[PDB]
Amino acid sequence: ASMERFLSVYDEVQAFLLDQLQSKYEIDPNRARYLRIMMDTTCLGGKYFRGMTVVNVAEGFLAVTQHDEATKERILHDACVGGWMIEFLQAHYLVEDDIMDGSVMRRGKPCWYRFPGVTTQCAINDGIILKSWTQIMAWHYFADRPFLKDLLCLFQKVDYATAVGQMYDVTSMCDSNKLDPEVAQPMTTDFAEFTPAIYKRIVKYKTTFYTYLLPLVMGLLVSEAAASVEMNLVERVAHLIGEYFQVQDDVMDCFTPPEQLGKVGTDIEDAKCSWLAVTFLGKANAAQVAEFKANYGEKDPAKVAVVKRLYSKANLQADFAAYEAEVVREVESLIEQLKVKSPTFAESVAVVWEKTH
Amino acid sequence: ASMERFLSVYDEVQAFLLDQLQSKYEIDPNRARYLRIMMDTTCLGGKYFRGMTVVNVAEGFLAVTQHDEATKERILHDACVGGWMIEFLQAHYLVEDDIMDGSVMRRGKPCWYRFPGVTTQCAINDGIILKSWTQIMAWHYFADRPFLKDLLCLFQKVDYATAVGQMYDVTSMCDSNKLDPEVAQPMTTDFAEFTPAIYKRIVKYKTTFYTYLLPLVMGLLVSEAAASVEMNLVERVAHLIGEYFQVQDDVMDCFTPPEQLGKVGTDIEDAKCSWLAVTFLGKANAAQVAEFKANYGEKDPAKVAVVKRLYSKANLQADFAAYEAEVVREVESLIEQLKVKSPTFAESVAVVWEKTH
Numbered sequence: 219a220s221m222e223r224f225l226s227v228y229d230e231v232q233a234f235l236l237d238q239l240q241s242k243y244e245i246d247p248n249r250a251r252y253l254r255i256m257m258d259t260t261c262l263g264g265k266y267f268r269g270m271t272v273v274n275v276a277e278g279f280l281a282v283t284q285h286d287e288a289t290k291e292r293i294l295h296d297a298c299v300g301g302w303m304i305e306f307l308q309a310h311y312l313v314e315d316d317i318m319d320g321s322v323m324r325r326g327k328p329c330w331y332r333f334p335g336v337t338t339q340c341a342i343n344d345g346i347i348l349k350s351w352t353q354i355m356a357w358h359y360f361a362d363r364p365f366l367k368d369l370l371c372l373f374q375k376v377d378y379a380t381a382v383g384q385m386y387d388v389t390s391m392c393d394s395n396k397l398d399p400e401v402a403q404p405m406t407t408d409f410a411e412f413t414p415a416i417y418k419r420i421v422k423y424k425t426t427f428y429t430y431l432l433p434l435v436m437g438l439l440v441s442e443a444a445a446s447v448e449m450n451l452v453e454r455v456a457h458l459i460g461e462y463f464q465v466q467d468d469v470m471d472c473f474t475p476p477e478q479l480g481k482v483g484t485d486i487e488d489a490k491c492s493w494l495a496v497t498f499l500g501k502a503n504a505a506q507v508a509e510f511k512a513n514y515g516e517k518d519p520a521k522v523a524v525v526k527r528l529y530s531k532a533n534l535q536a537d538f539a540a541y542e543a544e545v546v547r548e549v550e551s552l553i554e555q556l557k558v559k560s561p562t563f564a565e566s567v568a569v570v571w572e573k574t575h
Numbered sequence: 576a577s578m579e580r581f582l583s584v585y586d587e588v589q590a591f592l593l594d595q596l597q598s599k600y601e602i603d604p605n606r607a608r609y610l611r612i613m614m615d616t617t618c619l620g621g622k623y624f625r626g627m628t629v630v631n632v633a634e635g636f637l638a639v640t641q642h643d644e645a646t647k648e649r650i651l652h653d654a655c656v657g658g659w660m661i662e663f664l665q666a667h668y669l670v671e672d673d674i675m676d677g678s679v680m681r682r683g684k685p686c687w688y689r690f691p692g693v694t695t696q697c698a699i700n701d702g703i704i705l706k707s708w709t710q711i712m713a714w715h716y717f718a719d720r721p722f723l724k725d726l727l728c729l730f731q732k733v734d735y736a737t738a739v740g741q742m743y744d745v746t747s748m749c750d751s752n753k754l755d756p757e758v759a760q761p762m763t764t765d766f767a768e769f770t771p772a773i774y775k776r777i778v779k780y781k782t783t784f785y786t787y788l789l790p791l792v793m794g795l796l797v798s799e800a801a802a803s804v805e806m807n808l809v810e811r812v813a814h815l816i817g818e819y820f821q822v823q824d825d826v827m828d829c830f831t832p833p834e835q836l837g838k839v840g841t842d843i844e845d846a847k848c849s850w851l852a853v854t855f856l857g858k859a860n861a862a863q864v865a866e867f868k869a870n871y872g873e874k875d876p877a878k879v880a881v882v883k884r885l886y887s888k889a890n891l892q893a894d895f896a897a898y899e900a901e902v903v904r905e906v907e908s909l910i911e912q913l914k915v916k917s918p919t920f921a922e923s924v925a926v927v928w929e930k931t932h
């Protein structure tokens with residue numbers, strides 16, 4: 219089974235990386251153990267949606283393509299290594315993001331940097347190692363693969379788009395015209411940049427490229443099946459599902475219980491450009507807008523309670539329903555278009571959509 | 576002239592990166608301006624020793640190799656782009672290191688993260704962008720180059736070795752047997768791991784690979800001259816000069832005036848495994864060792880003054896002279912061995928040595 223194969227490949231890749239640190243990088247057992255625990259704590263515990271999407275895309279093509287048994291095993295092995303590259307890429311960004319944001323918890327566990335024997339000094343560098351390991355993996359396992367050049371080039375572009383997205387996100391509550399490394403940044407007072415287009419730009423770069431585009435395209439690359447698809451449709455369907463995934467995360471930050479979310483939501487206190495803030499500003503009257511402005515982006519629990527009350531009264535449950543109906547139409551339309559060149563890939567996209575919905 | 580060509584290529588690469596963010600990444604002018612200032616502040620102002628070493632290696636081979644004028648211009652252009660990849664790699668590590676260490680100044684200027692409109696939240700991500708740009712550069716300028724695969728593989732290994740070196744450095748004042756993400760780390764009381772071999776391991780990985788090995792080997796790769804050299808001699812001579820460079824930096828941290836160094840030295844307060852600490856422990860009597868242990872690794876200015884007094888009394892100026900004489904012998908021996916296959920490359924190493932000495 220796919221998940222078992224995927225998890226087995228983690229153990230193999232970890233053993234490879236730690237053995238190489240011992241044989242070629244002069245590491246001692248206690249530092250190898252620290253890095254083993256760092257890898258496990260930062261990479262394991264999720265649903266492995268991203269890595270498993272690579273495997274699932276590859277499995278779809280194996281069911282319709284003629285291959286020797288050893289070739290099927292090799293493609294599935296490459297899809298697992300590729301999937302782990304994405305999981306380690308996410309681990310890098312979550313470690314660095316939690317430090318940047320001074321976050322307390324990540325999926326019911328303390329953030330890595332908060333571990334007593336870690337600290338920010340080590341955690342910033344541990345995050346750097348996590349992304350370096352993605353490349354060590356690719357060069358070792360894919361050294362003689364025809365897709366190596368395309369895989370590394372795609373991975374690099376996605377990594378860069380993600381860092382750009384993080385920049386869009388951390389500066390989302392600043393007035394663009396005031397951005398200056400020499401001047402301390404005040405939070406916006408007009409919220410003029412809390413627009414659907416600006417929200418969509420943050421999400422496309424910060425989340426969509428690494429969460430949806432990269433796993434789908436990597437699955438195609440390891441299967442040598444990129445010519446079987448229209449790349450513009452893959453990008454368009456990735457943009458759409460990715461946006462919907464973030465809208466769900468934004469809604470959950472404010473309304474889902476902390477024990478179910480895995481953290482206490484701080485989007486309101488952090489003055490985040492969330493779907494809730496953008497949608498509320500898109501329908502509120504002048505008095506509700508003024509009340510939002512006097513309470514948004516402050517740690518004060520009573521001020522946070524006014525925002526949570528304004529959202530509940532705004533009936534954003536109805537806007538979400540209308541948004542969801544529109545996404546369903548467009549996702550289904552793109553899935554139909556994907557069937558022209560690849561009914562197999564279209565099914566893998568339908569699975570990805572079902573898992574998000 | 577080489578330096579002018581190098582600096583001109585910076586302007587061209589910056590224009591390329593910022594234009595691409597506008598054309599393909601949906602950036603707005605104020606964020607493009609922030610990134611332009613970030614690039615300038617973090618990448619410019621040094622001596623460009625690393626980047627210029629690539630150019631100098633390439634220039635050596637151009638004087639002895641038959642090429643059309645356009646090919647000479649292309650090789651020099653590639654050597655400049657390659658040199659900037661190394662300068663941006665260093666910029667990434669200095670930005671992240673200053674955050675990790677809570678440093679105040681870097682070469683007479685405040686550390687990037689301290690800029691009022693930057694903060695740690697942005698600076699950690701800016702550092703990430705600096706290293707992503709190294710790859711954007713390589714894929715754009717070297718897309719059809721025969722050396723692309725070897726250049727990216729080398730660059731990745733060096734980047735990884737550097738992150739491992741940072742791990743060796745930040746944990747250098749911990750007892751290895753006590754390293755544990757679950758337990759807050761006490762500083763060593765025995766200083767048993769302050770040995771020449773352990774010091775050499777920190778320096779080889781944290782500094783030597785990116786400062787000496789990478790610029791020399793990149794100069795060979797852009798010149799298609801790697802087969803003209805014995806790679807083991809290049810690594811050995813890089814290890815030696817790199818170690819000597821760090822010993823100089825360590826001595827300067829304690830004895831050189833802050834205005835000349837470009838910062839107030841904190842190695843003593845930070846309990847760093849410096850050449851001074853290792854050499855002092857290698858010759859001190861039982862009473863001097865006990866006095867060192869009661870004063871090392873504490874912010875207290877009076878305690879720092881005891882360590883500075885112990886070093887001055889230990890006559891470490893004599894150990895440095897004997898160390899320097901030994902390095903001169905071995906560096907000259909390796910330069911002689913390099914003359915067998917490449918007198919041109921041996922001269923480039925002699926220049927690198929002269930610039931360090």
Ligand SMILES: Cc1cccc(NCc2ccccc2)n1
Binds near residue numbers: 327328332
């Ligand atoms: C593996 C694991 C999970 C949960 C907690 C834990 N260690 C205690 C801790 C770590 C960081 C901050 C607070 C408490 N370890």
Ligand SMILES: Cc1cccc(NCc2ccccc2)n1
Binds near residue numbers: 400684685689690691
């Ligand atoms: C470009 C440049 C150089 C020196 C100082 C400066 N800005 C003021 C500042 C920045 C950070 C910390 C303290 C003071 N800008």
Ligand SMILES: [Zn+2]
Binds near residue numbers: 318319
């Ligand atoms: Zn964040």
Ligand SMILES: [Zn+2]
Binds near residue numbers: 467468471
């Ligand atoms: Zn969220």
Ligand SMILES: [Zn+2]
Binds near residue numbers: 672673675676744
């Ligand atoms: Zn440091």
Ligand SMILES: [Zn+2]
Binds near residue numbers: 824825828
């Ligand atoms: Zn130093």
